[PDB]
Enzyme design. Structure first.
Site, PDB file in Angstrom:
ATOM      1  N   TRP A   1      -9.327   6.358  -0.557  1.00 21.71           N
ATOM      2  CA  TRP A   1      -9.615   7.114  -1.768  1.00 21.71           C
ATOM      3  C   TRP A   1      -8.604   6.721  -2.853  1.00 21.71           C
ATOM      4  O   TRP A   1      -7.567   6.151  -2.558  1.00 21.71           O
ATOM      5  CB  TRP A   1      -9.571   8.610  -1.514  1.00 21.71           C
ATOM      6  CG  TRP A   1      -8.311   9.086  -0.858  1.00 21.71           C
ATOM      7  CD1 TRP A   1      -7.119   9.380  -1.468  1.00 21.71           C
ATOM      8  CD2 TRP A   1      -8.123   9.342   0.534  1.00 21.71           C
ATOM      9  NE1 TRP A   1      -6.195   9.788  -0.534  1.00 21.71           N
ATOM     10  CE2 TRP A   1      -6.788   9.781   0.703  1.00 21.71           C
ATOM     11  CE3 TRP A   1      -8.951   9.241   1.661  1.00 21.71           C
ATOM     12  CZ2 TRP A   1      -6.268  10.125   1.957  1.00 21.71           C
ATOM     13  CZ3 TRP A   1      -8.431   9.575   2.903  1.00 21.71           C
ATOM     14  CH2 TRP A   1      -7.101  10.008   3.040  1.00 21.71           C
TER      15      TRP A   1
ATOM     16  N   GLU B   1      -4.837   4.241 -10.680  1.00 24.60           N
ATOM     17  CA  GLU B   1      -5.632   3.058 -10.401  1.00 24.60           C
ATOM     18  C   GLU B   1      -6.812   2.976 -11.356  1.00 24.60           C
ATOM     19  O   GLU B   1      -7.146   1.901 -11.842  1.00 24.60           O
ATOM     20  CB  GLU B   1      -6.131   3.059  -8.960  1.00 24.60           C
ATOM     21  CG  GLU B   1      -5.099   2.655  -7.943  1.00 24.60           C
ATOM     22  CD  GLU B   1      -5.678   2.612  -6.534  1.00 24.60           C
ATOM     23  OE1 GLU B   1      -5.976   1.498  -6.057  1.00 24.60           O
ATOM     24  OE2 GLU B   1      -5.821   3.689  -5.912  1.00 24.60           O
TER      25      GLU B   1
ATOM     26  N   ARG C   1      -0.062   4.430   3.068  1.00 20.40           N
ATOM     27  CA  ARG C   1      -0.002   4.171   4.512  1.00 20.40           C
ATOM     28  C   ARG C   1       0.384   5.332   5.441  1.00 20.40           C
ATOM     29  O   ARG C   1       0.418   5.149   6.647  1.00 20.40           O
ATOM     30  CB  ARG C   1       0.960   3.024   4.793  1.00 20.40           C
ATOM     31  CG  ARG C   1       0.408   1.654   4.445  1.00 20.40           C
ATOM     32  CD  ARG C   1       1.480   0.625   4.719  1.00 20.40           C
ATOM     33  NE  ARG C   1       2.430   0.545   3.607  1.00 20.40           N
ATOM     34  CZ  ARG C   1       3.556  -0.155   3.646  1.00 20.40           C
ATOM     35  NH1 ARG C   1       3.895  -0.782   4.767  1.00 20.40           N
ATOM     36  NH2 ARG C   1       4.341  -0.219   2.568  1.00 20.40           N
TER      37      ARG C   1
ATOM     38  N   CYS D   1       0.807  -1.221   0.000  1.00 19.78           N
ATOM     39  CA  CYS D   1       0.000   0.000   0.000  1.00 19.78           C
ATOM     40  C   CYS D   1       0.845   1.279   0.000  1.00 19.78           C
ATOM     41  O   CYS D   1       1.582   1.546   0.933  1.00 19.78           O
ATOM     42  CB  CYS D   1      -0.940   0.027   1.212  1.00 19.78           C
ATOM     43  SG  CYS D   1      -2.010   1.482   1.197  1.00 19.78           S
TER      44      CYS D   1
END
Ligand code: HEM
Ligand code: HEM
Ligand SMILES: Cc1cc(N)nc2cc(-c3ccc(CN)cc3)ccc12
Ligand SMILES: Cc1cc(N)nc2cc(-c3ccc(CN)cc3)ccc12
Ligand SMILES: C[C@H](O)[C@H](O)[C@H]1CNc2nc(N)[nH]c(=O)c2N1
Ligand SMILES: C[C@H](O)[C@H](O)[C@H]1CNc2nc(N)[nH]c(=O)c2N1
Ligand SMILES: [Zn+2]
Lengths: 409, 414
Positions: free
Chosen positions: B284, B289, B115, B112
């Site tokens: 979000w 992506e 973070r 991720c």
């Protein structure tokens, strides 16, 4: 046990058996992966290493256990016994060199591995002779723009006190200079080496694209400076097919990428001087050489000339300027008929190459972190390709910069 | 292993030292002689003996984090958990522990990039849930809260943990909000090709498909091991953004849009040896992506070609980099649309810059930060983001988010 790699785009699944033959370590453990870390002899150690290499050589020419194979082993064992080392046959040398490239997990260009011109320079004794061999290499590899892959192999390491070394990181590179105010003229990647040259007596033009002199070290002696004849150094002025102002940036690059600071290892022997060359993937110049912060850093200037919005990052102005720069590079090389490959084409070949290797060899070691191009990653086929990385020999290895080790005479 | 591991940033020459890897728990898939870091995926239920040390390790860690290690409370909690495992072969987390565990599963998520926000996570405790209708209620409230009219807030909803493995809670959806994909007889796909399988499952379960390009899928919810049930998410709870371009008037004519809330619902949360098979969580988006993967992937919406045509790029040579050029404008559009509509979103330059600061802070204050370079580096323009030149160490800390099999492959139908 067999390991499977899947391509998530195509769902093609390959089975890896080749990794079972690897002996050198990756850097990883069962508990920590180190895939993104850039850098993770005696009679006694030497013969099994030699035995191993001789074995797969004769296995490659389908004569394993032949009389010639047996005799070669006996010959090598006796020669290590008496002299603490051994010399490779010419055939072995060539085989070993091609397979070091073949085994180079980080190279996306390996579909070419068996078309490698091998120049045997193990008779070399001086820096002058190194210079001659290197000039011949450059001339042959350049081939007036129709570039040809090549490697020149200088004498192997003996006691460690008599190493042959090319001190340049590449045969052809541009100088970088620390400016009085604090910025950098030329190529910042080469600022230290440039200063080493200047100390050794090199008179810098202090231009933006000064071809560095060769700094050559033979038999462990003090290195010597040489100027590559200018007519051997092919260069490409970078211009853009739409932006007619792009030439006004005054950029150019050299056509021959030729890495000279690595070590070739074959059957336990170490070749600390072995410059090798191919041709460029466009991003190597257009993305890294020109747009890295620690490099030429022309992203700002180009985006300004494209009159883009540069206040907010979310306008992707950096991204736009990057594509255009890489278009210019590809267009320039192709227009001057100098061999170059775009990352779409290169990555396609590599997938095809992987398939070949899994078929005929049972695997292909591949470093995803280095294989995926530094731009437009996921619209290239390798992004979605699972890879297994492992270390096969013969191999190219990193080695310390010689100015950290050398004791000047 | 040795006690210290160094990582270098080749752009700034900053060096970082990692001691946290010593707390690493599970295997990576790698070994001494092979690396598997680009491999996507390198009944069950734990026994009393397996569970004891796992819970102890987590409870020790929790009391260590609140500076009460070795305290009376620590020792009493340990004794309580031990007895509860002894006489029920499982145990229940306190609310504080649950909240702590969830935050740290995110903190520990090596893939991720977002973070830096890990401590700011709204945790919804849904362990009192007994039915799929109740699951539907909790999930609606999650979506409304997380969405916040475009001012997205990260959240997780945690349903009851696994017991005997026959009574699992599962969200069968891969995300709470996704578009249907329909396979056509002629070989083509309408809507999102990535979701064709789940769409067919829904249709088989009773869903009547609008058969459009952007049909929000129903929720398919399993409670306490029962057969899953279908529910329609109230349309007003689904915030969407039409994609338009700040320069190209025609980009709107493509009729593209996407949803604002990325909420993944097929992962398993593991805390102190307990397994939460249904734990939908959301944040979000990073633009790429949607703009690189969701749109430009070949086995996705694949609009690269059409965008290229409207840009009138030469599409016959790859070396013209028409794909690259199109990809940028698409991602420009996505970011522009979301920002214009005041829906939270982050570009890959901001996110990666923030992640580097986060990683450094973690090395400084925690002794490390597990990170997966292969996932952390964005799918476009990698080398001009600061994570490209940053060396990283990947290892698995617990609490954690894990993958788990799709539920239709294992579910025993009533
Ligand atoms: C023929 C055309 C070739 C192309 C297009 C090509 C392409 C590339 C590229 C793009 C890289 C990554 C470079 C970077 O980002 O710094 C690379 C790495 C590498 N190449 Fe190739 N290459 C070619 C030929 C060769 C040859 C002839 C050799 C040796 C005989 C070779 C050996 C290597 C090695 C050892 C590395 C990585 C070294 C390391 O970091 O471990 N390549 N190649
Ligand atoms: C707050 C804003 C967030 C941003 C911008 C963000 C960004 C990202 C991105 C870009 C990825 C890669 C996704 C892909 O390539 O498909 C990812 C993966 C991931 N995120 Fe985050 N994320 C956020 C919040 C969260 C939250 C709230 C959680 C959990 C509490 C979380 C847990 C994860 C996990 C477990 C993965 C990787 C899953 C896997 O292993 O496949 N993230 N994130
Ligand atoms: C033979 C060859 C061809 C090519 N196009 N690029 C190379 C790039 C390298 C290379 C160059 C630099 C580095 C570390 N900056 C690592 C590998 C080595 C050989 C190459
Ligand atoms: C919480 C969160 C936020 C965000 N922006 N993206 C995520 C993306 C994922 C994710 C998405 C897809 C996949 C596999 N295709 C794996 C993980 C999970 C959670 C995310
Ligand atoms: C084969 C490869 O591991 C796979 O395609 C990965 C690569 N890196 C990724 N990185 C992110 N962030 N998301 C992904 O889906 C992937 N896919
Ligand atoms: C930290 C990271 O490993 C390092 O920056 C690597 C990443 N991938 C790369 N890939 C290529 N081809 N060339 C590189 O120099 C790098 N740099
Ligand atoms: Zn690894």
């Amino acid at each position: 046990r067999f390991l499977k790699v899947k391509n998530w785009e195509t769902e093609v699944v390959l089975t890896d058996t080749l990794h079972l033959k690897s002996t050198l370590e990756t850097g990883c453990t069962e508990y920590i992966c180190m895939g993104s870390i850039m850098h993770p002899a005696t009679k006694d150690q030497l013969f099994p290493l030699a035995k191993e290499f001789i074995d797969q050589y004769y296995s490659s020419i389908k004569r394993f256990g032949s009389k010639a194979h047996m005799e070669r082993l006996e010959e090598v064992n006796k020669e290590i016994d008496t002299t603490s080392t051994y010399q490779l046959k010419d055939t072995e040398l060539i085989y070993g060199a091609k397979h070091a490239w073949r085994n180079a997990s980080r190279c996306v260009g390996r579909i070419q591995w068996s078309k490698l011109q091998v120049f045997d320079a193990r008779d070399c004794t001086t820096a002058h002779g190194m210079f001659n061999y290197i000039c011949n290499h450059v001339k042959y590899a350049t081939n007036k723009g129709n570039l040809r892959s090549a490697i020149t192999i200088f004498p192997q390491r003996t006691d460690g006190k008599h190493d042959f070394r090319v001190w340049n990181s590449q045969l052809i590179r541009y100088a970088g200079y620390k400016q009085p105010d604090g910025s950098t003229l030329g190529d910042p990647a080469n600022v230290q080496f440039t200063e080493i040259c200047i100390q050794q007596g090199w008179k810098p033009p202090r231009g933006r694209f000064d071809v560095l002199p060769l700094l050559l070290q033979a038999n462990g002696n003090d290195p010597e400076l040489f100027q590559i004849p200018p007519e051997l150094v092919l260069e490409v002025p970078i211009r853009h097919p739409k932006f007619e102002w792009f030439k006004d940036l005054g950029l150019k690059w050299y056509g021959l990428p030729a890495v000279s600071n690595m070590l070739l290892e074959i059957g336990g022997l170490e070749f600390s001087a072995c410059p090798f060359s191919g041709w460029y993937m466009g991003t190597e110049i257009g993305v890294r050489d020109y747009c890295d912060n620690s490099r030429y850093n022309i992203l700002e200037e180009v985006a300004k000339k494209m009159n883009l919005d540069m206040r907010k990052t979310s306008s992707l102005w950096k991204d736009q300027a990057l594509v255009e720069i890489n278009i210019a590079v590809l267009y320039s090389f192709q227009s001057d008929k100098v061999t170059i490959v775009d990352h779409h084409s290169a990555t396609e070949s590599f997938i095809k190459h992987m398939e070949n290797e899994y078929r005929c060899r049972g695997g292909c070691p591949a470093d995803w972190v280095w294989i995926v191009p530094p731009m437009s990653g996921s619209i290239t086929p390798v992004f979605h390709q699972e890879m297994l990385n492992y270390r096969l020999t013969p191999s190219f290895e990193y080695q310390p910069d010689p100015w950290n080790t050398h004791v000047w005479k």
